[PDB]
């Protein structure tokens, strides 16, 4: 019963803030060029860009590269979000976050070069096996709790928690990716953004919201890892939102009592009554029955044996990812959106 590991976490976080602020103030820009990399294959796609596997030609190292079409980013009102993404990424440091290695831009596109995580998305693994066991789910949930404790101490909200954005590394640990919607926020913010299934009630109701929306998404994630489907689903988004705001959730018959209790406290529609956002903060979650067998330090130190390790076929193997149609990356002769992305 010696929680002076609390004082140790407090000391760690105070230091992490110093480091963050130092990097936040003097951000890195244009640390690479497009033809220093060999484009190999598409790992994922979006409305305003794509993510590719690339090979740094000098060093031979593989990376993931996110390519955003400036014109499409402007068209889709994502300018501020992409500047958030890069600025936050370059200033953070935590064992369960994908690391930004380089960023740059040319006439047509923004580029962010980051760690490649060859184990693929949690999403694919979960859909294939159906559901994870509670120990297996708990393993990942523990990493997300530590990650949000880190991010929130720096006033960062992540805002896109879902299996799709959690990659699994060679040791079975989580690497959080896609900081597209991440924002530094002291107090409230107002943008309607996220994935419908994972949207907190405050977001849906356009009232102004804070870091508590991430603890809500954690409830949805733990539920989906353990159930195999999310707590609120429907054919169309509109029906999903109505379910989210209703205050009604049903749990599989195989959910433990402890898990059901945790999830009722995470999926509280009133944010003032939600775990993570009460007086004791994250400690309400860390000290909850369901996490009773969790060694929080050992998990941070990566000393716990992972319940599942993806198949590794070598560096540059992408068999844990789906196939996407390929498109040649064209760079225009004329600079597009120069003013909009001058800070990038």
């Amino acid at each position: 019963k010696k929680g002076s590991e609390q004082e140790s976490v407090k000391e760690f976080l105070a230091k992490a803030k110093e480091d963050f602020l130092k990097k936040w103030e003097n951000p890195a820009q244009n640390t690479a060029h497009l033809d220093q990399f060999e484009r190999i294959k598409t790992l994922g796609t979006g409305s305003f860009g794509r993510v590719m596997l690339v090979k740094h030609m000098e060093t031979g190292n593989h990376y993931a590269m996110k390519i955003l079409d400036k014109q499409k980013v402007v068209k889709l009102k994502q300018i501020e979000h992409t500047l958030n993404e890069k600025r936050i990424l370059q200033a953070v440091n935590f064992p369960f976050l994908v690391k930004l290695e380089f960023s740059f831009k040319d006439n047509s596109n923004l580029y962010m070069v980051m760690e490649y995580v060859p184990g693929g998305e949690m999403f694919s693994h979960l859909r294939r096996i159906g559901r994870f066991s509670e120990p297996h789910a708990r393993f990942y949930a523990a990493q997300i709790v530590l990650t949000f404790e880190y991010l929130h101490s720096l006033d960062l909200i992540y805002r896109d928690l879902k299996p799709e954005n959690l990659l699994i590394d060679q040791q079975g640990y989580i690497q959080v990716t896609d900081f597209g919607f991440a924002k530094r926020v002291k107090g409230r913010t107002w943008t309607l953004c996220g994935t419908p299934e994972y949207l907190a009630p405050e977001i849906i109701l356009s009232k102004g919201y804070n870091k508590a929306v991430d603890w809500w998404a954690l409830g949805v994630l733990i539920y989906e890892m353990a159930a195999g489907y999310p707590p609120f689903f429907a054919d169309q988004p509109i029906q999903i939102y109505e379910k989210i705001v209703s205050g009604k959730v049903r749990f599989p018959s195989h959910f433990s009592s402890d898990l059901k209790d945790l999830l009722r406290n995470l999926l509280q529609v009133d944010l003032t009554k939600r775990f993570g956002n009460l007086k004791n903060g994250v400690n309400d979650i860390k000290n909850h029955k369901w996490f009773a067998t969790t060694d929080w330090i050992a998990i941070y130190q990566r000393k716990v044996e992972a319940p599942f390790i993806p198949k590794f076929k070598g560096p540059g193997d992408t068999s844990n990812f789906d196939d996407y149609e390929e498109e040649e990356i064209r760079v225009s002769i004329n600079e597009k959106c120069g003013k909009e992305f001058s800070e990038f």
Partner: peptide, 20 residues
């Protein structure tokens, strides 16, 4: 069962953000 209804809905695949 809720699992069969989930497979029956159109939302078992990779989910896009709303964007905006």
């Amino acid at each position: 069962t809720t699992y069969a209804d989930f497979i029956a809905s159109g939302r078992t695949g990779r989910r896009n953000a709303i964007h905006d």
